[PDB]
């Protein structure tokens, strides 16, 4: 209910190191719990071995689709979707974690990490944590993306959990 979360990242199977996130449990406890417990894999499934399937330079890294690995899947610890908890935290800076969705109250497991302020998403996507180590890895992954979001290397979460 409070430990920071890590992802180890590889790019075409080359380990690039660890990203660490602080989650905003005091602002969005239900959303933060979902991401943390998908990272620990405590329910038997989650982010370990998943990929970032859509990476757009000067915008964000999108991942978390551990069922279909293409944006059409993912599921939360509460079921296939759960409500938007609130929108109090805004997309003010690089390195923010926020939930991807398919309209109101369709949160599952997919998330993005911003590389710029994305204020136009305020009030529509729930922001729930921030990178505190490894923003350099985020920028390296970002460079493997493209305007369409297609990556030119496989970006994998090889391990994840709490620190």
């Amino acid at each position: 209910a409070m430990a920071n979360v890590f992802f180890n990242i590889s790019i075409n199977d080359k380990p690039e190191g660890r990203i660490v996130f602080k989650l905003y449990d005091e602002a969005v406890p239900k959303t933060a719990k979902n991401f943390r417990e998908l990272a620990t894999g405590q329910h038997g499934f989650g982010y370990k071995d998943s990929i970032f399937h859509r990476v757009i330079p000067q915008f964000m890294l999108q991942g978390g689709d551990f069922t279909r690995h293409n944006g059409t899947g993912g599921k939360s610890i509460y079921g296939e979707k759960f409500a938007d908890e609130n929108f109090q935290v805004k997309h003010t800076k690089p390195g923010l974690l926020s939930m991807a969705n398919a309209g109101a109250n369709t949160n599952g497991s997919q998330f993005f990490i911003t590389t710029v302020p994305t204020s136009w998403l305020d009030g529509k996507h729930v922001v729930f944590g921030e990178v505190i180590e490894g923003l350099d890895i985020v920028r390296k992954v970002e460079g493997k993306g493209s305007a369409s979001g297609k990556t030119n290397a496989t970006i994998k979460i090889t391990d994840c959990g709490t620190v």
Partner: peptide
């Protein structure tokens, strides 16, 4: 445009 959608990807 700049969107983060789960399956209907929009401009």
């Amino acid at each position: 445009x700049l969107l983060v959608t789960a399956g209907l990807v929009l401009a």
